[PDB]
């Protein structure tokens, strides 16, 4: 990650340096004239081309879903496609990614995560493989101009295009795919192929349809760029250049490819075209096709939450919504907009009208503080996505003050408005942010600081380009005048850089958090009290004193976890009320980030998946939990399986296998450890160990065979008396097979008599077992294992298996 961040920053800086060289021979007035020279029919055609491209994207998704096999309604599929493609195109995995938004939509719609990951991989690979073939097709079409545009001889371009096409049609199509076609497809359109692992690649018809859709999409994009530009080359060379630029921009991982795409366009069509018309076309195309779609998708997502999850009185903890991660995007956009407006000189007439009413030193101070507030909002955008109440309040106040300072600065209807709208939108979604955590303790990945550095560099580039009329001198910094705008921009840029550097240093020199430690007796007693006050007997595994605890700081909650390698594997869902469960999950996620460790969960209940999703964990079913319902369990009603169970009960009662219950810490121990030794003739994090205090914590039930203790099992209970679960099981080998079933049914009967509504038989792994568990005809619920960002589950499962012993 640090290497990738450094490489991306270096590439962005090189791209900006190259861009400034290419637009060296243009003044801002020429660019403004070129922008104003674009006719209204050109703008209308640009909007129409963007709409057509978005219909084509809807197609992208429809084909991807048909490839995966997931069946979705047309409206839901269209909404998901538009949202994912608008969010992913504007920003690349910086705040929100296409995978994350499509997960948050489809998983809510009730679709497994593996299919969604398949869809995302298929769309990405389809675009990445369609780009080279279309580029080669355009080259084959018009190499006469392609040689001139790219500045290489036509022979080399022709031979490389032909070689690329031949390699694709041979290996990509037949030699490496039809030599090993495969036996059968799982969905309608697939061809699973041999290799190290089976691969899901579409059939010939689906591949042809996807290629046609991608060709139409890139044609629409090149078309909007083409028609927004007055003087144009032939469409084939322009399309080739556009495809190469898109590949270069998306290959650099820069969000939106802003640095390199413009650089390639300006380096390929500089001499043959007009620098001012080309720059105006590039800026207008980016604004129309990237910023406006992002704004529209953000508004649509917030409308969906404001209607489908606010009009109905859900009365639930508002998490996993799109409020936080999209409001963070809006706040980042507001921050970058303020930073950019700081560099550009104000409108002459507006500046004069303002300065004839407000003191000019106030204008300078407002400019500087507005730039600082822009940097602050840009940095606070990270806090909003983590759902911090303090971040919400601070960002709202800063946005309001920034709007006021933009009005006080050179009169700006635009910024002021945009900001007021963002502030109102943030205010309307207060309930999404709930954590009372402190901003100064917020972990910061290098990605966000890199984005901040990139935006600051962009602002300084805009400062250098826009204020090139005024010559540079050391007296500019000391200059203070109303008409002077270059000194203003210089001071604002210097202050923003100083503030950002100070904040980055302060957050980089922070002391490391304390390492994990084994809990002491007081924390064990606290955990026991919390478990007793809760209704999750599965949490009693914390009392073994083998897992670190993360107590919630309000009144009552905890979360067991253990660190293996670079992964902080956790136990079941945090114990406590639902209102504190999400907060504890967020705290655990923050803790893992500070330690640079990947968060991993284990055996997660189906109800809490929204929180695991919104902190950035991918669901993965791994087993089933049997749950015998004690509500009815009638002794008279019988069937094929129930008759043999009561026969077992009768045989055990006749044999003399009477079962006895004991209070906690009051059972014989030497016989119990003898039974355990016989059973094993250690392990943890799933069952526990044989410790006198650990077994003392819970009640112990022992079954006696002709008076001797032969088997026992640990009992988990709660004060709520809602659910009961079994901790660990041990039977002496000399006992008959009748013993285990009799113990099971005796515990079930006692728990039913005591009044407990439900009983738990444990969790059975997914994919020769489960035959014994299903004998008691229980209700079965899924159990999920969460992994971060859809990483490799093999490493996580191997680590859990290694830690289990």
């Amino acid at each position, epitope marked *: 990650q640090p290497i990738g961040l450094v490489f991306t920053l270096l590439l962005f800086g090189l791209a900006l340096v190259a861009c400034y060289h290419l637009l060296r021979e243009i003044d801002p007035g020429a660019l403004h004239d070129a922008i104003a020279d674009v006719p209204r029919p050109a703008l209308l055609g640009a909007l129409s081309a963007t709409a057509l491209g978005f219909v084509i994207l809807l197609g992208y998704e429809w084909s991807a879903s048909r490839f995966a096999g997931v069946t979705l309604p047309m409206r839901s599929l269209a909404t998901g496609g538009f949202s994912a493609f608008a969010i992913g195109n504007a920003v690349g995995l910086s705040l929100l990614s296409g995978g994350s938004v499509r997960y948050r939509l489809y998983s809510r719609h009730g679709i497994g995560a593996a299919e969604i990951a398949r869809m995302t991989l298929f769309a990405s690979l389809s675009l990445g493989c369609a780009l080279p073939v279309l580029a080669a097709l355009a080259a084959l079409c018009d190499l006469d101009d392609a040689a001139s545009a790219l500045h290489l001889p036509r022979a080399l371009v022709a031979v490389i295009a032909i070689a690329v096409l031949s390699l694709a049609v041979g290996l990509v199509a037949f030699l490496a795919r039809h030599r090993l076609p495969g036996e059968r497809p799982s969905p309608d359109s697939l061809l699973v192929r041999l290799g190290r692992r089976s691969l899901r690649l579409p059939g010939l018809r689906l591949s042809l349809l996807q290629l046609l859709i991608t060709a139409l999409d890139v044609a629409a994009a090149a078309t909007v760029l083409y028609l927004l530009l007055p003087e144009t080359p032939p469409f084939a060379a322009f399309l080739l250049v556009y495809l190469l630029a898109l590949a270069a921009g998306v290959l650099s991982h820069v969000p939106g490819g802003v640095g390199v795409f413009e650089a390639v366009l300006l380096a390929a069509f500089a001499g043959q075209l007009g620098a001012a018309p080309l720059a105006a076309a590039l800026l207008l195309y980016r604004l129309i096709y990237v910023v406006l779609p992002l704004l529209l998708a953000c508004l649509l997502l917030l409308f969906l939450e404001a209607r489908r999850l606010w009009v109905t009185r859900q009365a639930i903890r508002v998490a996993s919504g799109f409020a936080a991660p999209i409001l963070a995007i809006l706040v980042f956009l507001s921050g970058v907009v303020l930073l950019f407006s700081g560099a550009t000189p104000a409108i002459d007439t507006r500046l004069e009208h303002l300065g*004839f009413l407000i*003191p000019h*030193r106030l204008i300078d*101070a407002s400019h500087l503080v507005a730039s600082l507030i822009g940097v602050l909002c840009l940095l606070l955008a990270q806090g909003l996505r983590r759902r911090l109440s303090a971040a919400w309040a601070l960002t709202l106040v800063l946005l309001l003050v920034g709007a006021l300072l933009s009005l006080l600065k050179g009169f700006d209807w635009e910024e002021a408005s945009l900001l007021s709208l963002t502030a109102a939108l943030l205010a309307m979604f207060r309930r999404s942010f709930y954590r009372p955590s402190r901003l100064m303790e917020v972990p910061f990945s290098p990605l966000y600081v890199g984005a901040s550095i990139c935006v600051v560099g962009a602002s300084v580039w805009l400062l250098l380009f826009a204020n090139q009329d005024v010559h540079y001198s050391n007296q500019l910094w*000391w200059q*203070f005048a*109303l008409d002077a705008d270059a000194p203003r921009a210089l001071r604002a840029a210097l202050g923003s850089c100083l503030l950002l550097l100070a904040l980055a240093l302060g957050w980089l020199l922070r002391a490391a958090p304390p390492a994990i430690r084994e809990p002491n007796a007081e924390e064990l007693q606290r955990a026991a009290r919390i478990i007793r006050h809760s209704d999750q007997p599965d949490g009693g595994l914390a009392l073994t004193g083998d897992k670190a605890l993360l107590f919630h700081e309000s009144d009552d909650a905890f979360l067991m976890y253990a660190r293996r390698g670079r992964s902080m594997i956790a136990l079941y869902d945090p114990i406590g009320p639902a209102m504190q469960r999400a907060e504890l999950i967020w705290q655990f996620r923050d803790l893992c980030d500070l330690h640079h460790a990947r968060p991993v969960f284990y055996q997660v209940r189906a109800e809490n998946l929204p929180f695991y999703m919104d902190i950035g964990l991918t669901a993965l079913k791994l087993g089933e939990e049997a749950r015998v319902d004690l509500l009815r369990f009638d002794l008279e009603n019988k069937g094929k399986e129930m008759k043999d169970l009561r026969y077992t009960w009768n045989r055990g009662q006749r044999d003399g296998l009477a079962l006895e219950f004991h209070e906690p810490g009051q059972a014989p121990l030497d016989e119990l450890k003898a039974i355990s030794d016989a059973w094993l003739g250690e392990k943890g994090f799933s069952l526990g160990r044989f410790t006198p205090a650990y077994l003392n914590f819970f009640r112990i039930a022992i079954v006696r065979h002709q008076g001797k203790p032969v088997a026992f099992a640990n009992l988990l209970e709660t004060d709520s008396r809602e659910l009961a679960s079994l901790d660990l099981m041990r039977v002496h080998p000399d006992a008959p097979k009748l013993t285990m079933e009799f113990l099971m049914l005796g515990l079930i009967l006692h728990y039913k008599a005591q009044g407990h509504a439900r009983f738990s038989l444990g969790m059975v792994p997914l994919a020769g077992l489960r035959r014994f568990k299903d004998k008691f005809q229980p209700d079965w619920e899924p159990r999920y294992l969460a992994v971060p960002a859809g990483l490799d589950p093999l490493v996580a499962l191997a680590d859990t298996a290694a830690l289990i012993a």
Partner: nanobody
Amino acid sequence: GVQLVESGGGLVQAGGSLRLSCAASGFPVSSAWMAWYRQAPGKEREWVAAIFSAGQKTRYADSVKGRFTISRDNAKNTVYLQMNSLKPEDTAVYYCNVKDTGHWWDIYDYWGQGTQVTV
């Protein structure tokens, strides 16, 4: 500790001419943006003219683009604004406004007491 002192002494013009002086102490009146305004009786506030810097840039109002001709002494003295042909709407008080000085810490807008100018 900056003050502005006016002296115009105008009662009646009837299409004549008069001169106004705005004394200044705190600032050198050399690199200090400063101007004049108008407060008609019962009306809102309007401006008349301005001097930007070094006695070079001087923007006038809409109705007095060529009527008036203001100038600055260029030293640490008063600036001069003069009256001209009959403007019935000019029967108002005239303030002396200073919004910028050489100081970078000066945020306040200092005004003048104003002179009753009538035709």
